[PDB]
Design a protein around this ligand. Structure first.
Ligand SMILES: CCCCCCCCCCCCCCCCCC(=O)OC[C@H](COP(=O)([O-])OCC(O)COP(=O)([O-])OC[C@@H](COC(=O)CCCCCCCCCCCCCCCCC)OC(=O)CCCCCCCCCCCCCCCCC)OC(=O)CCCCCCCCCCCCCCCCC
Ligand SMILES: CCCCCCCCCCCCCCCCCC(=O)OC[C@H](COP(=O)([O-])OCC(O)COP(=O)([O-])OC[C@@H](COC(=O)CCCCCCCCCCCCCCCCC)OC(=O)CCCCCCCCCCCCCCCCC)OC(=O)CCCCCCCCCCCCCCCCC
Ligand SMILES: CCCCCCCCCCCCCCCCCC(=O)OC[C@H](COP(=O)([O-])OCC(O)COP(=O)([O-])OC[C@@H](COC(=O)CCCCCCCCCCCCCCCCC)OC(=O)CCCCCCCCCCCCCCCCC)OC(=O)CCCCCCCCCCCCCCCCC
Ligand SMILES: CCCCCCCCCCCCCCCCCC(=O)OC[C@H](COP(=O)(O)OCCN)OC(=O)CCCCCCCCCCCCCCCCC
Ligand SMILES: CCCCCCCCCCCCCCCCCC(=O)OC[C@H](COP(=O)(O)OCCN)OC(=O)CCCCCCCCCCCCCCCCC
Ligand SMILES: CCCCCCCCCCCCCCCCCC(=O)OC[C@H](COP(=O)(O)OCCN)OC(=O)CCCCCCCCCCCCCCCCC
Ligand SMILES: CCCCCCCCCCCCCCCCCC(=O)OC[C@H](COP(=O)(O)OCCN)OC(=O)CCCCCCCCCCCCCCCCC
Ligand SMILES: CCCCCCCCCCCCO[C@@H]1O[C@H](CO)[C@@H](O[C@H]2O[C@H](CO)[C@@H](O)[C@H](O)[C@H]2O)[C@H](O)[C@H]1O
Ligand SMILES: CCCCCCCCCCCCO[C@@H]1O[C@H](CO)[C@@H](O[C@H]2O[C@H](CO)[C@@H](O)[C@H](O)[C@H]2O)[C@H](O)[C@H]1O
Ligand SMILES: CCCCCCCCCCCCO[C@@H]1O[C@H](CO)[C@@H](O[C@H]2O[C@H](CO)[C@@H](O)[C@H](O)[C@H]2O)[C@H](O)[C@H]1O
Ligand SMILES: N=C(N)NC(=N)NCCc1ccc(I)c(Cl)c1
Lengths: 83, 347, 48, 100, 140, 111, 95, 98, 171, 174
């Protein structure tokens, strides 16, 4: 550890540009896995409707599928509004 | 070259070939050839001399031209079928362009001129890769597109290579050029049987690679690149001359040696298809190769050529070259005929 | 126009299938004025 | 049409300015190798190879819109790291030196 | 090349000699042109005229062989009244071989060419009668 | 798909460890060991017996599996052929066999 | 592939881009998606020797969608005839 | 086929004939090689765009990237040839005749 | 090959919704809530039949629902709506966020005089379900009968009869 | 007419190819390839290939062809030979130019032509797609997919570019 700190002080004195580069590059690799917000990036992208939502033929056995856009069933974006 | 870089470049040569062999998409096949060609140039150039630069440049121009023609065939195939799947092509003009492109890469006659010149101009180890490993990727594509190949075109390429390879080797005293023309002739056997039984193409390719590797390894052990240099082997490593004799007789297709097997099975497959004139013509024409293999055996093993006084200094030092796999390769190159039915593993 | 062309059948499909096929540009605007065709073909690509 | 007009105007004007610049009243009645340096060649080639990697990164703003963000982020970083490795190799092999 | 060979083998042997001699002469001329093209590309002539002289020399030499073979083999079949006979082609093949000796001004080449080309033509006739395949279609 | 020995090959009897082909493979491995000694100028018969043993063992080990695939590929060929013959009886009719008393053969005297 | 590593491992290295009727970003279909689908489904599993003869109708339709040669030829015919009649003043086109 | 394919196919043939009929400069033959790539890029792009083969839209870029890398290798060989002889003339690359 | 059947010019006639795109954009959110059922019935038909000729009747109902939708805005909320879509029409990108005041006046007017509630963020992008008496198509692709699969192979794998049978080899 | 813009660009494309393919001084050959590259981008642009068209400018012209001219000025030609002063170049240029014109004349006269193969001559606009009302660029969606679907393409492509650096440093070290 002490040898690790002595090495870091040496590079900080002689090559601060490279030290900063490696530190930034290390944060870029690591921080997405530690961030609680990374999961919303997946959800927001999926929630963007690029193409038409084709309706399903009602067979009488789809209680979880809304009949009207304003009916309660179906995905909600309330989590996105509060974000 | 740095030893680690040399390893990574060798692995890239292999990776490019592997990509060609595992790909189902034509673009990835093209990428495999591009990556493979990029990585092989540095081992042609590694000895840094005008001859190695000329060989690398002649090689680059040939392979780049062939890859452009291949990409044309792929794009024409896309236009007329709307897909990239590696298989039969869906347009006869595309088939001719891909067949010609792959013939150029393999150095088949009449696209053969680069093979003797490039092999002569590069080190023995690089020539070993050029004449063995580099045949794998183009042959594996031919293995998959052969249903759509024009029969007359492929058999014409095969017949020309057997004639050009046989005649070209008669005038050679350089070992690398002898191997180059020998390679051209052997490619002709591989493609002549491909329309009838691709399995026999694989058998010929594998056995050819084994005997070709054996010969290059034995040349490398003694640093011999010319006939006259090889004629000094008897006065240094007498065992090596016997191994060279046995391997050359095998490459000549003489029973009871392993090199008889591919010619034997190709003749069988062609006769089953009522092809009689062609196999007979091929077998007789292959006697040209036997002639200049026999010439090498005369000057290497069956006679003792004049020596030099300084050779005595060599008697006091042992062989220190790796000669990797040589004992195994030579035994497979000569003693495999009794196991011929094992070819079914390639089915 | 093709009333007196021998053998011509009017509105004959070029496809074996009877499935509806989306017409290409020349099928819809084939006989229309060049200004409309130009707008339908290159108007979006050329817009500012 | 507008862009074609703009381009034609810009270069047509540039041609005209060159014209009058070369012809105004004057009022008077009376393939070898260029001392080739290998270092400048390697700068150009290095620029080319880095330029091709930039071509591969340019789609990134659109790629971030995917639902497959796990794959997309991993490949984006992989490409940039390999670019850094290329620079590191050139650097440590004295490819960025101008002496000798 | 398939169109001329279709014309030649369509005519019965020993009949319509002039048509037969035209097909073989044109076939011989094509081979001569092919040889000239490779010869000029791989062995550069000293001048443009030298390249033209060589092309004509090879091309006429090859058409001369093609003409004599066609004419001689068609007369032999007519005179002997033996259409489906390989011996007519052997006679026609050897005649073409002698021309090569004359055009190359040699006696050994003419004798060697007569025997080798004479046998080859006879073999070609046998294969036509017996349906021998050179480039056989894959069947099994 | 891309399998050296598919699972269906296990219904076939294994090659015997005394297979004559396997013995020949072992002999080839022995020969390679001697040629290794010879090219390096060691005593051909005695030098490096540990190395000579691995040459034989390696050849036999690889040879055994190659023989297994060989036999399985020929079993598959026969299986395919017999199934196709059953599926297409019209192409393989059972031949009407006559005796030599009924069959006429020309006689060609040697005189 | 010569060695079908992809199927052996179940990994998809390049199959995703081999045909235009495969999955696409945002379900954007190709113009000939329905023709490719019909031809692929007709020819599936029977081998190219059989499919060349038995799926010829689907393949001919698919090739027509790809390059539109027959459609262009038919349009060429109607336009060529229309120019003739107008050149002879026998036809006036509607607005 | 559509009318554009005529000229794009012609352009490839022109550059292919240019590549196969060398003059003196090795650079001139490299330009024909890159001309071949250009015509391939355009033809592939036209086919892919017109057919709306969405995922294939990246293919011309991959072709461009790899072909540029191949051209970089070719240029490196040209300069090494030029360093040896002082020109990029292909008539100097005839040592392996013997 | 046969004749492409086309509906007559008269079968295509319908009363058009001849309003500009800023008008449609302004009314889009209430339009989606109000005319959902005929609209979703039409879109189900199109994606199931894959043929515009087979959904002309449903397409006409889509037009009628929209015309009645805009007749109710005209009757009650003509002035607030006109201010709103004029605000949208000014923007080169027709942006909602530039017109929140006017949108509020129109939204309050329709709610007061028509009970219309603007659907929330995410509502109109839902996959809903439609009840249709139209029969589900059987062969929408008009596929031919698929070729018969090759005769399968079944049985017990036995050793090859007399081995390889290659020339003289006995195994 | 502007309805033939793609065809007109393709004609110019061919003439530029005949330009450098007849192989004048590499300085002029490089110029001919640059003009063909720009015209080639224009053809791609008119098929909806906005991003692809601009890559030719950015990468082919601004990258590869810049390096070609840089190398030509440094290792090939420093002073161009007068254009078409050589007989073979002039003959090859004239021969190709006449072939293109004869092609273009007939296709425009008959609205078709058979140059080895059959080509329609009604205008490339006829094959265009008649329905497009998506809220995105399809070309952009396809190219963006390189990072989601094309993991394997990224790996091999990125690896090859790294080996390109390594290989070129080896080649030139000498
Ligand atoms: C059925 C068809 C016909 C038969 C087909 C048979 C195909 C061939 C089978 C494989 C034969 C390979 C050679 C057998 C080994 C003999 C050499 C030996 O004993 O080395 C012992 C080896 C070192 O021996 P050595 O003193 O350096 O002499 C080397 C010989 O001169 C030799 O050195 P080398 O330069 O020639 O290299 C040999 C070896 C590399 O050298 C080795 O390290 C031995 C590795 C042999 C592995 C054999 C695996 C066979 C089973 C496949 C699974 O290469 C390999 O790795 C094998 C691939 O000792 C070990 O470390 C054992 C390997 C430990 C793992
Ligand atoms: C270790 C002990 C293992 C054990 O317990 O069983 C031993 C084993 C007893 O097995 P078994 O179950 O009691 O039945 C043995 C019957 O004799 C075998 O009865 P079979 O029904 O299995 O018939 C033998 C069968 C077995 O399948 C094979 O093909 C195996 C190939 C045997 C190669 C023999 C090498 C000698 C080549 C001819 C000289 O061979 C064939 O089907 C065709 C004959 C192939 C002979 C090669 C000639 C064709 C190639 C032309 C080039 C060579 C000409 C020279 O003893 C042997 O039979 C030895 C087999 C011979 C090869 C291994 C010994 C190496 C011989 C070196 C000769 C070098 C030649 C010098 C010149
Ligand atoms: C559509 C398809 C595309 C159509 C292309 C349209 C044109 C667009 C441009 C295309 C690129 C053309 C590239 C031409 C070029 O750069 O080559 C320079 C090439 C060598 O350049 P050089 O270093 O300045 O030397 C000039 C002479 O070769 C003199 O050099 P020398 O030192 O060797 O002097 C002795 C002379 C001796 O000349 C002779 O003896 C030939 C007489 C043969 C009579 C038969 O040597 C030669 O003539 C060599 C050629 C011999 C003929 C080879 C057999 C063919 O010169 C030529 O051969 C000019 C020919 C140009 C004609 C273009 C015709 C294109 C048609 C291609 C076939 C497509 C058919 C469908
Ligand atoms: C089955 C055939 C297997 C063939 C194995 C042959 C191993 C190579 C020959 C052994 C001789 C000792 C040796 O090291 O080989 C020479 C060569 C290395 O080159 P070298 O000059 O010795 O120094 C390299 C540093 N620059 O070694 C090499 O560079 C490797 C070149 C050979 C690789 C291609 C082998 C053929 C393809 C095998 C696939 C089989 C199917
Ligand atoms: C089994 C089924 C398959 C059947 C196929 C047939 C396979 C046969 C080929 C097997 C592969 C070749 C293996 C040959 C081993 C050779 C070893 C040998 O016999 O000794 C060589 C001899 C030794 O010399 P040295 O190293 O100096 O040691 C002794 C010191 N005075 O060195 C010398 O003294 C040189 C003597 C002059 C050379 C005379 C050559 C004629 C003898 C040829 C024997 C090899 C057969 C070649 C044809 C095969
Ligand atoms: C694929 C289908 C292509 C069919 C054509 C195949 C022929 C390709 C020939 C390639 C090898 C030719 C190499 C060669 O033979 O050298 C060139 C040769 C020149 O020889 P020449 O000038 O005629 O004789 C001078 C002697 N004083 O020129 C020739 O004579 C070669 C003639 C070969 C054709 C017969
Ligand atoms: C069941 C038994 C069957 C036996 C016969 C089988 C024949 C088929 C196998 C032949 C394949 C080659 C065998 C491997 C060769 C090994 C022998 C060798 O290569 O060296 C010769 C050696 C010379 O003796 P040495 O004084 O030790 O000098 C060594 C030189 N470095 O020689 C020696 O002194 C070592 C003693 C044994 C040497 C045997 C030599 C055989 C020669 C084969 C000739 C080719 C086949 C004909
Ligand atoms: C020389 C080769 C160099 C290669 C370098 C590759 C570096 C890659 C580092 C990061 C890779 C993964 O980076 C990130 O990890 C977290 C782990 O929770 C993932 O997970 C996060 O996003 C996903 C969405 O897909 C959510 O479902 C999940 O709840 C969330 O935690 C992210 O989707 C991913 O973007
Ligand atoms: C030293 C010897 C060197 C090698 C010699 C090789 C000899 C090979 C024999 C020649 C090939 C056999 O000859 C070939 O046989 C087939 C069999 O119908 C003929 O085939 C022909 O059939 C009919 C006529 O019957 C024709 O209408 C048709 O055009 C053609 O296909 C060929 O026209 C003929 O050229
Ligand atoms: C020589 C280099 C050695 C290193 C070898 C590294 C090989 C890496 C292989 C990467 C591909 C792995 O396998 C593949 O991965 C991606 C996700 O990662 C998956 O792909 C996934 O995302 C995209 C987006 O839709 C689609 O391809 C597909 O819908 C989905 O499956 C594939 O379904 C899976 O088959
Ligand atoms: N294309 C060819 N003519 N050859 C070919 N491989 N035929 C397939 C017949 C065959 C032969 C041996 C075996 I063992 C198996 Cl399993 C199958």
């Amino acid at each position: 550890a002490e040898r690790v700190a002595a090495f870091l002080k040496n590079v900080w004195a002689k090559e601060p540009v490279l030290v900063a580069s490696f530190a930034i590059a290390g944060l870029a690799v690591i921080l997405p896995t530690l961030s609680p917000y990374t999961k919303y990036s997946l959800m927001i992208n999926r929630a963007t409707p690029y193409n038409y939502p084709v309706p399903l033929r009602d067979d009488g056995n789809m209680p979880d599928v809304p009949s009207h856009p304003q009916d309660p069933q179906g995905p909600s974006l309330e989590w996105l509004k509060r974000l | 070259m740095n030893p680690i870089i040399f390893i990574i470049i060798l692995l890239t040569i292999m990776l490019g070939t592997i990509i060609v062999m595992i790909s189902s998409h034509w673009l990835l096949v093209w990428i495999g050839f591009e990556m493979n060609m990029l990585a092989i140039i540095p081992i042609m150039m590694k000895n840094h001399n005008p001859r190695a630069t000329e060989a690398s440049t002649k090689y680059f121009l040939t392979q780049s031209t062939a890859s452009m023609l291949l990409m044309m065939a792929v794009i024409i195939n896309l236009m007329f079928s709307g897909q990239w799947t590696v298989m039969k092509l869906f347009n006869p003009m595309a088939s001719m362009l891909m067949t010609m492109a792959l013939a150029m890469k393999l150095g088949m006659a009449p696209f053969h001129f680069w093979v003797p010149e490039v092999t002569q101009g590069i080190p023995l180890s690089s020539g070993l890769i050029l004449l063995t490993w580099q045949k794998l990727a183009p042959m594996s594509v031919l293995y998959q597109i052969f249903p759509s190949i024009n029969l007359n075109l492929i058999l014409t390429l095969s017949v020309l290579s057997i004639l050009i390879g046989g005649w070209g080797g008669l005038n050679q005293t350089q070992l690398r050029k002898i191997m180059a023309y020998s390679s051209i002739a052997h490619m002709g056997w591989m493609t002549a049987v491909l329309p009838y039984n691709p399995t026999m193409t694989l058998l010929n390719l594998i056995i050819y690679i084994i005997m070709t590797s054996t010969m290059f390894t034995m040349f490398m052990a003694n640093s011999t690149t010319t006939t006259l240099s090889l004629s000094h082997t008897w006065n240094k490593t007498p065992i090596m001359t016997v191994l060279i004799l046995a391997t050359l007789l095998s490459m000549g297709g003489l029973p009871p040696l392993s090199g008889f097997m591919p010619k034997w099975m190709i003749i069988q497959e062609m006769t089953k298809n009522n092809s009689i004139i062609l196999p007979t013509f091929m077998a007789i024409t292959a006697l040209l190769n036997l002639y200049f293999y026999m010439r090498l055996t005369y000057s290497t093993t069956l006679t003792m050529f004049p020596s030099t006084n300084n050779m005595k200094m060599k008697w006091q030092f042992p062989l220190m070259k790796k000669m990797t796999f040589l004992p195994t390769m030579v035994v497979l190159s000569t003693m495999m005929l009794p196991l011929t039915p094992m070819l079914s593993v390639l089915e | 126009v093709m009333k007196d062309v021998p053998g011509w059948k009017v509105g004959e499909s070029v496809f074996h299938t009877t499935r509806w096929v989306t017409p290409m540009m020349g099928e819809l605007y084939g006989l229309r004025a060049s200004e409309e065709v130009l707008s339908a073909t290159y108007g979006f690509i050329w817009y500012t | 049409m507008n862009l074609m007009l703009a381009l034609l105007t810009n270069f047509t004007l540039a041609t005209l300015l060159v014209i009058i610049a070369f012809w105004l009243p004057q009022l008077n009645v009376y393939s070898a190798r260029l001392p080739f340096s290998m270092k400048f060649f390697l700068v150009a080639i290095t620029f080319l190879l880095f330029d091709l990697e930039i071509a591969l990164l340019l789609p990134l703003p659109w790629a971030s819109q995917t639902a497959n963000l796990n794959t997309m982020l991993t490949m984006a970083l992989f490409l940039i790291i390999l670019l850094a490795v290329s620079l590191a190799y050139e650097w440590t092999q004295k490819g960025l030196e101008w002496t000798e | 090349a398939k169109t001329v060979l279709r014309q030649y083998w369509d005519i019965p042997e020993g009949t319509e000699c002039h048509r037969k001699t035209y097909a073989t002469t044109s076939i011989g001329g094509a081979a001569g042109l092919v040889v000239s093209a490779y010869s000029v590309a791989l062995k550069t002539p000293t001048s443009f005229l030298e390249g033209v002289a060589r092309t004509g020399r090879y091309t006429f030499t090859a058409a001369a062989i093609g003409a004599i073979f066609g004419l001689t083999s068609c007369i032999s079949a007519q005179v002997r009244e033996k259409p489906d006979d390989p011996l007519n082609y052997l006679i026609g093949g050897c005649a073409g071989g002698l021309i090569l000796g004359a055009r190359t001004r040699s006696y050994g080449i003419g004798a060697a060419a007569c025997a080798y080309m004479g046998l080859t033509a006879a073999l070609v006739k046998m294969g036509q009668l017996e349906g021998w395949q050179v480039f056989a279609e894959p069947k099994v | 798909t891309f399998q050296f020995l598919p699972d269906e090959a296990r219904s076939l009897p294994p090659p015997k460890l005394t297979d004559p082909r396997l013995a020949f493979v072992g002999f080839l491995g022995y020969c390679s060991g001697l040629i290794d000694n010879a090219i390096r100028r060691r005593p051909v018969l005695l030098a490096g017996l540990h190395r000579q043993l691995l040459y034989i063992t390696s050849f036999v080990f690889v040879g055994y599996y190659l023989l297994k695939r060989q036999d399985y590929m020929y079993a598959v060929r026969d299986h395919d052929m017999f199934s196709y013959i059953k599926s297409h009886p019209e192409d393989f009719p059972e031949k009407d066999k006559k005796t030599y008393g009924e069959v006429f053969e020309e006689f060609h005297p040697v005189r | 592939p010569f060695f079908d590593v992809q199927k052996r491992l179940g990994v998809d290295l390049d199959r995703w881009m081999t045909i235009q009727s495969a999955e696409q970003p945002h379900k954007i279909p190709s113009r000939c998606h329905a023709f490719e689908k019909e031809w692929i489904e007709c020819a599936h599993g029977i081998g190219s020797i059989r499919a060349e003869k038995e799926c010829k109708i689907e393949f001919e339709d698919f090739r027509e969608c790809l390059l539109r040669q027959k459609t262009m030829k038919r349009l060429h015919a109607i336009r060529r005839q229309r120019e003739k009649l107008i050149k002879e003043g026998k036809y006036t086109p509607p607005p | 086929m559509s009318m554009v394919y005529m000229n794009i196919m012609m352009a490839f043939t022109v550059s292919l004939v240019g590549l196969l009929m060398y003059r003196s400069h090795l650079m001139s033959s490299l330009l024909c090689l890159e001309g071949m790539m250009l015509s391939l890029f355009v033809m592939a792009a036209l086919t892919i765009l017109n057919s709306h083969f969405t995922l294939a839209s990246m293919m011309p870029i991959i072709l461009l990237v790899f072909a540029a890398c191949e051209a970089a290798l070719g240029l490196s060989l040209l300069v090494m040839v030029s360093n040896t002889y002082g020109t990029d003339y292909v008539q100097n690359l005839n040592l392996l005749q013997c | 090959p046969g004749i492409v059947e086309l509906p007559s010019l008269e079968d295509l006639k319908v009363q058009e919704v001849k309003v500009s795109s800023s008008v449609l954009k302004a009314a889009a959110h209430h339009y989606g809530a109000q005319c959902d059922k005929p609209n979703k019935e039409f879109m189900l038909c199109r994606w199931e039949e894959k043929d515009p000729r087979r959904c002309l009747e449903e397409g006409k109902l889509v037009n009628q629902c929209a015309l009645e939708f805009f007749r109710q805005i005209k009757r009650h909320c003509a002035e607030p709506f006109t201010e709103y879509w004029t605000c949208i029409d000014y923007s080169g990108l027709q942006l909602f966020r530039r017109c929140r005041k006017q949108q509020a006046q129109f939204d309050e007017c329709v709610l007061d005089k028509l009970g219309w509630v603007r659907p929330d963020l995410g509502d109109l992008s839902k996959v809903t379900k439609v009840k249709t008496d139209r029969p589900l198509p059987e062969n929408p692709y008009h596929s031919r009968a698929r070729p018969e699969p090759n005769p399968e192979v079944e049985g017990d794998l036995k050793p090859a009869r007399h081995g390889s049978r290659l020339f003289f080899w006995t195994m | 007419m502007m309805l033939y813009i793609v065809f007109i660009l393709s004609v110019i494309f061919v003439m530029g190819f005949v330009g450098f393919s007849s192989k004048p001084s590499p300085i002029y050959g490089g110029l001919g390839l640059i003009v063909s590259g720009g015209v080639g981008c224009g053809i791609v642009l008119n098929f909806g290939g906005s991003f692809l068209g601009l890559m030719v400018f950015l990468i082919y012209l601004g990258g590869m062809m810049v390096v070609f001219g840089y190398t030509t000025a440094m290792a090939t030609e420093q002073y161009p030979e007068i254009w078409l002063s050589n007989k073979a170049v002039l003959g090859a240029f004239v021969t190709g130019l006449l072939m293109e014109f004869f092609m273009v004349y007939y296709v425009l006269k008959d609205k078709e032509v058979e140059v080895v193969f059959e080509f329609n001559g009604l205008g490339d606009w006829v094959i265009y797609d008649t329905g497009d009302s998506g809220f995105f660029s399809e070309e952009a969606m396809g190219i963006a997919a390189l990072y989601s679907y094309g993991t394997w393409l990224v790996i091999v492509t990125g690896w090859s570019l790294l080996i390109g650096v390594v290989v070129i440093m080896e080649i030139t070290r000498g």
